[PDB]
Design a protein around this ligand. Structure first.
Ligand SMILES: Nc1ncnc2c1ncn2[C@@H]1O[C@H](CSCC[C@H](N)C(=O)O)[C@@H](O)[C@H]1O
Ligand SMILES: Nc1ncnc2c1ncn2[C@@H]1O[C@H](CSCC[C@H](N)C(=O)O)[C@@H](O)[C@H]1O
Ligand SMILES: Nc1ncnc2c1ncn2[C@@H]1O[C@H](CSCC[C@H](N)C(=O)O)[C@@H](O)[C@H]1O
Ligand SMILES: Nc1ncnc2c1ncn2[C@@H]1O[C@H](CSCC[C@H](N)C(=O)O)[C@@H](O)[C@H]1O
Lengths: 332, 331, 332, 331
C-alpha cells in the first residue's frame, strides 16, 4: 500500500531521471510534437520530480496539472517555484483516482511502465485518468507492446539448483536440511530474473502483445492472457521465456518509440526472464505453444502462470512466478 | 510489520544468515560448550526461523525447546524437526512471542535478535519481552550486548555520497533547474547509513562502548537510547562521521563466548555501519570530540537516530539524523 | 611399481632438499653426532641427490654406500665426482632389497618418511636393510611417533558435500545426475585431506604410536593397529582425526628430533586429516574411543579404516580412506 | 596404461570435464543443432565416461547408442542410463574400443578424445581405431582438428622456470656443490610444457595451423607427427618459445560448430600450452622464423616431442625436447 515511501526519496527519482534513454526519449517525444502541446491543457499522472511536466512546459502547454501521490510532490512544488512556472504548472498531491482536477485536459502524459511493463500496476492509474481526457484527447505514451520469446541459458538454470542445494546438506552443524531442498528449489523458480543478455540466446522471434491506452479500460489489466505460438529457429533446451517492452508516443507530427529491447541500448528496466522448472527440448522447425497468464494480486503486482509445450514431442512445462519478488542478476 | 515477517519467510533469507559461519558457528560453540546451561532443561527460542538454534539446543541435551517463529518459516522449521527425529523435544510454536502462550516457564531463552547497529529491526524488544517466561535464576543467550562507536576518516566515502546528492545542484537538467532541492538531496543521502566493511586504519580514537545487559533491561528501555561519548583524538584529520559495530556475549555456566562484528574481527553478514556527517569536523590529535547518539523508537518499527558531535577545542558542532529505513549497502 | 620415475626428476629431489626443516635437521643430527660417523661405514638407503651421504661425509665417515632405485642415481654419481668424494661415497643403483653391498655397515641413514609417516611404504625398505647392519649398529632416524587427534572443522566437512552436489542436479544439459550423488559423496570422503590447520581445532591431546627402527621387522608395517582412547577437552562435533609425525635421531652425543607437528614450523609433509562421514557429537569429559587400522595395499600405500564412537552416547562412526589418492587443500 | 584408466575412473575427474561449460555446451550445441546426423540413427560414443555425450545423442533422437567406457566409470554411466529411462536406447559397453565387439555398424561416431596440445593422452588413436565400425558415408564428431602454434615473448615465464633450475647451480648447498648438475636441471625444466593461459598481446606472428581430418586419418598416422612452420615475425623481441592451442570442428549436415581453445576465445579446462626454449631466439620484425615440431609416439603412451627453430636471417638455431609426461600447471 505505502510503496509511495519508495517514490518519496529523491534518490529513486534520480535513478529514473538519469536513465538517458528513458528521460531523453520522453523529452524528444514531447518537443518534437510541439503542436500536441502548444497552448493545450495537460495531465501528468505521477509527476514525481516534475521532469515530464517541465517538458510539457518547454513545448508550450498553457496549463499542466501534475499529480503526485508520494511526498515527492512537495519537492515537485519547490521545483516549479524556482523554475518560475507557477503560472503554468500546478502540483496536486494525492492519487489520480482520489484528487480532483479543475478542468478536462487535452493530453495525458505519464511514465507508468514497470518491469515486464505491467509491474507496480500503475498503468491502471494511467488508464483510470482517462476520466479527465477531453473527447479525442491524446495519451503519451499511446500504446505499449510486450514482447516475449524462448531462450536457452544453461548457466542461469543451474544457478537455481546450485543455490537451492545449500538445503541438501545432511549435516549442517549437525542438522539434516535435505527435507527442505524441494521448497528451496521452488522459491528460486518463483523469481523472475532481472538482467540483460546476449540476443543470441533467443530461439524464436518474439511475439508481441498490444495495449492501446486510448481504448483500453482499467480492468483489462487484472487479467492479461498472452497466448503464444513460437516457431523455433534453433534447436536446444528451452529454459524459459524472456520479456521486454516498447512504448509509443503517437503525436500529430511524429511517432517516437521508447524501446527496452535486448537489441536497443540498456535501460533501468533491463529485461525479465522467467525460467521453466522443466526445460523443454525443442528443435528448429518445432512449435512452442502455450499461454502466459498475468493475474493482478494484492501486493500491487502480477501472478505469472506460464504454460508451455513442444507440439512435436508433446512434453510440457508449467511454471508459476511471483513478480513482486524478482532476482536482480545484473552485475556488469 | 507485515513486510518484516514476509522477509524472514523466504528460505533464501534464512539461508543467508545460516551461511554466515562466524554467527552460526559462534552460537553453536556457545550452546555446546556450556551444555550444563541446557542439559535436561526447558528452552525458549524466540524467532527460531529455520530452527537452527533450537537444534543446537537439542544437541546440548535440552529436554524441551519451545521455538517461536512468526513468519511462514514456522512450517519449514517443523518439517526439519520431523526429518531430524526431534519431535521428542522441539515444539515449533507459530506466532509472535508477545501473542503466544507457552505452557511452561523456561530455564533459559536463546535468540539471535540482532540487526545492523545492534538495534535495527527492533527485535531486542521482543527478545526482552519474552523474559516473562523466564524463571528466577534463568540465563539468556546472548547475555549482554556492547555497542561500539568510533570516529573515522574516509574522504572517498564522503565524496561518493556527496557527488550523488550533487545531481540535485544542477542549473539545467534537460533545461531544468534542480538547484532548489540541492539542500534536500544532501539531507536525504547523509541520513543513509553506509553498510560495508573498512580497514581499521581509518579509525581515529579508541571506541567507546555502550553495554545493555539483557538479564536486566525492560522492553521499554530500548524506546529511548541515549549514547554519550568522548573521543580523545589520536590523529589529526577530517572527521567524516562515526563507525558502529557490536559485540555479543553468551555468559554461560562454563565459559563466556563472544560474537563480534568488530572491524578487527572476521567479517559477518552485519558488516559494519558507518554514518556520515554532512560536513566533516576538523580535529587535532589530543583534542576531545564529544556529543551523543539519540535513538528514539518509533511507530514503523524504527529508529529515529540523532547524532550531535563537537570538537570541544574549536566549538565545531555537527548534528545529523539517520534514516535506518534507507541503508546504502556499499558492498 | 614405477613411482621411481617420480623420484628421477631433479625437481622432486629439489623439493625435499628445499624443505629447510627437513634437510637442516638431518644435517644438524649427523654433524652434532660426529662420533656416530667418524671413520664408520654408512648405508644411505634411497640417497636420491646424495645430500644425506654428503652429510655423512662431512661428519667423517670412512665409507658410505648410497643406494638409489631411480635414475636419480646417475646424478648422485655425477655429484660425488665433482665434490671429489669418489674415495668415500659409493653410489649403488637399484633397490636395497636387490643390490649387494660389499660390507656390513655401522649406521643406517635414510629419509623414508611419507604422509602420515607410513605413506609410500619406504619404511619397509628402511627396515629391510637391517640385514647390512653390524650387530649393535645404529639407525638414523631411530624411532618414529605417529600422533593422531580429534578435530572440529565444519567448513572442511562441507566442502565435501558442496563438491559432491554437482551430482545432485536434476537437469544438467538435460540429464538427471542425482542417482550418482551418493557415490560422489563417498569418493570425497575416501580422500585424506593434506594441509595444515590452527591447532585450536583440536579437541583432545594426541595419542602417539611408536615404531622403533632398531627393533621393528619389515612385516610389522603391513598391519598397523592404532587403538585410541581420547578424553575430550572441548565440546563439539568431531569431524574426523588429524595425523602428524615425529622422528628421532638418537645419537651417542645427542637426540635430535624432526617434528611435523601443527605446533612446529610447517614442512613439506603438512598434516593429514581424515574426515568421518558421520560427525560425532561429544562434550568435554566424554571419551572418544576406537581404532585406526592401516592395511598395506598393492599401490604402495595404506587402506585406512577408522572406527570411532563416543562412549557416553554410544553413537558411532566408521570410515574407510584411500591414502594413495589424497586431496591437497593447502593454498596459502 | 593402468594409471590413465584409473584417472578417468574418479567421478571428480569426470565432473571437472563436465563442469567445463564451453566444452560440454559446444558438444551439446553441435549434436542438437544437426539432429539429422542422429535422428533415428545408430551412434557410437568412444570413452563415454559419465555418459554425457550419449545423452545428447539420445536428445537428438538417435535410435541406438553404443557407449564404450574402459574405466570403472562404465558402471556409473549405466546407473545414469537407468535413472534417466534411456535403457531403451543407450547401451553401455565396458572395455576398450579396440577390444570390444559391437553387434552392428554405426551411422556416426562421437567422442571427446582431446588432450593438451590436442594429442596428449593419445586417445585420438583409439578414436580413429573405432572407424572400423563406421559405415560408408558415416560422419564423425568431431570431424577435423586444427592445431595452432605461434611464437611468444614472456620473460617472466622464462625467468620463473630458469630460476627454479638455478637451484642446481649452487657452489655449496649445506656445504655441497650441485653446479655439476646445473646443465641437467635446465634440460629437465625446459622439457616441461607450461600449461596456463595468457594475453594474446604476447604472441608475435600469425599462427600456422596443422589440420588432421578425422574422416580420413588412419590410426598409425599419429605415430609420427611432423609440423613444419614459417613465422613471418611481426614484432622485434626475444622469442621465448611457442604457444600451442587447438580448435575442433563438428562438420554436420546442418551446420559446422567449432570448439576452440584459442587464447582469443573463452577459457577451457585445456587452457593453452606453451613450450620454452632454453635460450630465447632474437628476431626482428619482418624476419622469418622457421623449423619443425616432431611428435614421435612412444611406448608409455606419449609423445616424444621435438622442436627445432631458427631465425633465418641470423642462422640462430634452437632445438628442444618436450616431456608431455611432466607438465607445469602454472594456473
Ligand atoms: N496512482 C497514483 N497517483 C498519483 N501518483 C502516482 C500513482 N501511482 C504512482 N504514482 C507516482 O508516479 C511516479 C512514477 S515514477 C515516474 C516519475 C516521473 N513521472 C518521471 O517520468 O520521471 C512515482 O513518483 C509515484 O509515486
Ligand atoms: N516478535 C517476534 N516473534 C516471533 N518471531 C520473531 C519476532 N520477531 C522476529 N521474529 C523472527 O525471528 C527470526 C530472526 S532471524 C534469526 C533466525 C534463527 N534464530 C537463526 O539463528 O538463524 C526471523 O525469522 C523473524 O521472523
Ligand atoms: N626400495 C628402495 N631402494 C632404493 N631406493 C629407494 C627405495 N625406495 C625409495 N628409494 C629412493 O629413496 C628416495 C627417497 S626421497 C629421499 C631423498 C634423499 N635421501 C634425501 O633425504 O633428500 C627416492 O629417490 C627413492 O627413489
Ligand atoms: N581406448 C579407450 N577405449 C574406451 N574408453 C577410453 C579409451 N581411452 C580413453 N577412454 C575413456 O574415455 C573418456 C575420455 S574423457 C571424455 C568423457 C566424456 N565423453 C565427456 O565428454 O565428458 C575417459 O573416461 C577414458 O577412460
Amino acid at each position: 500500500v505505502q510503496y509511495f515511501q519508495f517514490y518519496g526519496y529523491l534518490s529513486q527519482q534520480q535513478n529514473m531521471m538519469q536513465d538517458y534513454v528513458r528521460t531523453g526519449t520522453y523529452q524528444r517525444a514531447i518537443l518534437q510534437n510541439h503542436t500536441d502541446f502548444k497552448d493545450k491543457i495537460v495531465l501528468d499522472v505521477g509527476c514525481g520530480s516534475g521532469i515530464l511536466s517541465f517538458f510539457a512546459a518547454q513545448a508550450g502547454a498553457r496549463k499542466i496539472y501534475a499529480v503526485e501521490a508520494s511526498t515527492m510532490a512537495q519537492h515537485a512544488e519547490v521545483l516549479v517555484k524556482s523554475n518560475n512556472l507557477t503560472d503554468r504548472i500546478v502540483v496536486i498531491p494525492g492519487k489520480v483516482e482520489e484528487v480532483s482536477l479543475p478542468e478536462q485536459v487535452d493530453i495525458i502524459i505519464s511514465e507508468p511502465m514497470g518491469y515486464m511493463l505491467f509491474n507496480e500496476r500503475m498503468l491502471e492509474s494511467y488508464l483510470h485518468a482517462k476520466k479527465y481526457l477531453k473527447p479525442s484527447g491524446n495519451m503519451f505514451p499511446t500504446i505499449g507492446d510486450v514482447h516475449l520469446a524462448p531462450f536457452t541459458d544453461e548457466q542461469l538454470y543451474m544457478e537455481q539448483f546450485t543455490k537451492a542445494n545449500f538445503w541438501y546438506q545432511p549435516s549442517f552443524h549437525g542438522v539434516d536440511l535435505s527435507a527442505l531442498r524441494g521448497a528451496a528449489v521452488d522459491e528460486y523458480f518463483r523469481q523472475p530474473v532481472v538482467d540483460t543478455f546476449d540476443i543470441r540466446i533467443l530461439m524464436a522471434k518474439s511475439v508481441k502483445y498490444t495495449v492501446n491506452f486510448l481504448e483500453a479500460k482499467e480492468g483489462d489489466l487484472h487479467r492479461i492472457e498472452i497466448p503464444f505460438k513460437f516457431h523455433m529457429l534453433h534447436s536446444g533446451l528451452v529454459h524459459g521465456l524472456a520479456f521486454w517492452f516498447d512504448v509509443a508516443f503517437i503525436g500529430s507530427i511524429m511517432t517516437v518509440w521508447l524501446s527496452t529491447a535486448p537489441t536497443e541500448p540498456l535501460t533501468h528496466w533491463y529485461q525479465v526472464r522467467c525460467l521453466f522448472q522443466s526445460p523443454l527440448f525443442a528443435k528448429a522447425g518445432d512449435t512452442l505453444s502455450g499461454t502466459c497468464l498475468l493475474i493482478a494480486n494484492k501486493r500491487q503486482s502480477y501472478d505469472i502462470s506460464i504454460v508451455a509445450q513442444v507440439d512435436q514431442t508433446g512434453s510440457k512445462s508449467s511454471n508459476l512466478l511471483d513478480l513482486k519478488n524478482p532476482f536482480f542478476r545484473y552485475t556488469g
